Each structure stands twice: as C-alpha cells, then as structure tokens.
C-alpha cells in the first residue's frame, strides 16, 4: 500500500479511538504528510483540521500544534488555516486558548515576513493578513482576560509583538534563537502594502498597553513578574525603549499594587531588583545611570550589587 492509503487507514483508525491516545495516531499521520511525503499535506489538511471539533482538550491542542507545523512547512497554507486558528483562539477552554496564543506568537512573525516578501498582495493574502492582524489585536485585549494564565500568555505574545514591530540597533541584545526573526529594520520603507510607519505606531501602542498593564493596581504576582521580565527583555533587545521601561519600574515602585504591598512586599522588591539589575548590566543603561542607581538604592539593593552589575563604558563601543 501507498503512503496516502496508509494515511487514510490511520485516519479511519483515529476516528474509532475514544481517548486521547488517538493523538499517537494523528502524529503518525502528521509525520507522513509533513515529513515523509510533503505533497500529501494539501490533500489531507481537511482530515486533520476536522479534529478541531473533538471534545478532548489535548486533541484540539494537537490540532493547534499541527497548524503551526504546517504553516512553518508552507506559509501559504496560512491562507486556509488562519480561520481555524482563529476558532481555536476563541475556544471555550482556557488551555486551548493559551496554546493558540503560543502559536500566534510563532506565526505572526512568519506571516509578516511573508507579507513583506510579496510585492503583489492577492485578495486571499490580504484577508489572511487582516485576520492575523485582528487576532494580534484580540490577544492584546486578552491582557484583560479574567483568567490569570491567559493574561500571562498574552504578555509574552505582546512582548514578541513589540520586539517585532521595532528596529534592531547596534547594541541590541539578540537571543541566538531569534537571530533570523523579522524586525522593523528588515522592512523596506517603500513596500506598497505593509507600511513601516504604521507597524512602528502599532509596536508603540502595544508597548503602551503593556506599560499600563504593569502599573494596574489589580494584577497578580505571576502576571507582574512576567511583565517585569518582558519589559526587561524589551529594554535589552530594543534599547530605544529603556527609558520607558525604567520609568515603568519607578512608577510601580512608587505605587505598589495594594494586595502586594505588605507581606508580599519583600518578594515584589526582590523581583523588581533582579529585573532592574538585568537592565543595568546592558551597556545602554549608562545613559540612565542616576535614575537606575537611585531606583536600585530605593529598592534596598546593596551598593556592592549595584557596583558588580554596572557595565564598563568599554562595553559601549
């Protein structure tokens, strides 16, 4: 029997399995159609995507993972799969939503790169980009989800967005895994469709949402520390934002979220200090030395710890 005959037989078996172990069979299918005979991907998309209706949470999560792998293998499948991903982002179960946010964090930057490399934008490709972009806007709105784990994942997606939609600079720290990710500097300024200025504004607006979130008197401990880490990552990857990040830290410290200001205060300060020190260690910090140092002392950072983390101006070259 042929590969596509095997795929049909596995799919028919997966349909008879009544527990999550059907994912074993679906991953066999995914390996056949994504890696063994990639030409089959197109032919059996419908069959895999059909499992987005499965009642099992792990099965819907599998389908989100599958969409990510398929779009990473052929980004144009995003044309037929963005709508299914949008349904999973609105899932009734928060674990499916979280997994869909993870996936958008990966796929947004790849759809954008694809738009940026197209000189002529088809109707399908335009509606696909419109949807990618409303989904990003909806995930930013998820900063106000009533679910703590969703807000946490939204923070990370928003972090990734701010970094995508701002330019790399010469002293930008770039985690090696993100070396080849698109950023604003890699966007031609006369692309007829994707407008540089608009994406910049959009990155700035995303950052303003994340700064406001950070300050909010009602956010939780896990959200706060995720946001603090995100802001620190942003300041080191995009040093043009360092000022705004330092200021956000000053502001959080002046106005502690009432629920975290007594028994939890030691923890919040230790967290704020650890993140602030990571910013200080970045050479662009030398421009804000008095402001950072003053904030570090006010948090009760020992002098030795400030001194140890101060970058040399040699690292400014």
UniProtKB/Swiss-Prot annotation:
In testis, expressed in polar epithelia and Sertoli cells but not in vascular endothelia. The protein is detected in stomach, duodenum, pancreas, liver, fetal brain, carcinomas, lens-forming cells, fibroblasts, lymphocytes, lymphoma cells, erythroleukemia cells but not in endothelium of vessels, epidermis, intercalated disks, Purkinje fiber cells of the heart and lymph node. HEAT repeats lie at residues 2-35, 38-72, 75-117, 124-163, 198-237. Residues 1-95 are annotated as: Interaction with HSF1. It is found in: Cytoplasm, Cytoskeleton; Cell junction, Tight junction; Cell membrane; Cell junction. Could be used as a differentiation marker in the differential diagnosis of tumors. Belongs to the Symplekin family. Found in a heat-sensitive complex at least composed of several cleavage and polyadenylation specific and cleavage stimulation factors. Interacts with CPSF2, CPSF3 and CSTF2. Interacts (via N-terminus) with HSF1; this interaction is direct and occurs upon heat shock. Interacts with SSU72. Scaffold protein that functions as a component of a multimolecular complex involved in histone mRNA 3'-end processing. Specific component of the tight junction (TJ) plaque, but might not be an exclusively junctional component. May have a house-keeping rule. Is involved in pre-mRNA polyadenylation. Enhances SSU72 phosphatase activity. The HEAT repeats have been determined based on 3D-structure analysis of the D.melanogaster ortholog and are not detected by sequence-based prediction programs. This is Symplekin. It comes from Homo sapiens (Human). The gene is SYMPK. The chain holds residues 30 to 346 of 1274 of the full protein.
């Amino acid at each position: 029997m042929t590969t596509s005959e095997r795929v049909v037989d596995l799919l028919n078996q997966a349909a008879l399995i009544t527990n999550d172990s059907k994912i074993t069979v679906l991953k066999q299918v995914q390996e056949l159609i994504i890696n063994k005979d990639p030409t089959l991907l197109d032919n059996f998309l419908d069959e895999i995507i059909a499992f987005q209706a499965d009642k099992s949470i792990e099965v819907r999560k599998f389908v989100i993972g599958f969409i990510e792998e398929a779009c990473k293998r052929d980004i144009e499948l995003l044309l037929k799969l963005i709508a299914n991903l949008n349904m999973l982002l609105r899932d009734e179960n928060v674990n499916v939503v979280k997994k869909a946010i993870l996936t958008m964090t990966q796929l947004y930057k790849v759809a954008l790169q694809w738009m940026v490399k197209s000189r002529v934008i088809s109707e399908l490709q335009e509606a696909c980009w419109d949807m990618v972009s409303a989904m990003a806007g909806d995930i930013i709105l998820l900063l106000d989800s009533d679910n703590d784990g969703i807000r946490t994942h939204a923070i990370k997606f928003v972090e990734g967005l701010i970094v995508t939609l701002s330019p790399r600079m010469a002293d930008s720290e770039i985690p090696r895994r993100q070396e080849h990710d698109i950023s604003l500097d890699r966007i031609p300024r006369d692309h007829p469709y994707i407008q540089y200025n608009v994406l910049w504004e959009e990155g700035k607006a995303a950052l303003e949402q994340l700064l406001k979130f950070m300050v909010h008197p009602a956010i939780s401990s896990i959200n706060l520390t995720t946001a603090l880490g995100s802001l620190a990552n942003i300041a080191r990857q995009r040093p043009m934002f360092m000022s705004e990040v330092i200021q956000a830290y000053e502001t959080l410290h002046a106005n502690l979220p009432p629920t975290l200001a007594k028994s939890q205060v030691s923890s919040v300060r230790k967290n704020l200090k650890l993140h602030l020190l990571s910013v200080l260690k970045h050479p662009a910090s030398l421009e804000f030395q008095a402001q950072i140092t003053t904030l570090l002392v006010d948090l009760g950072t020992p002098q030795a710890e400030i001194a140890r983390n101060m970058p040399s101006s040699k690292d400014t070259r």
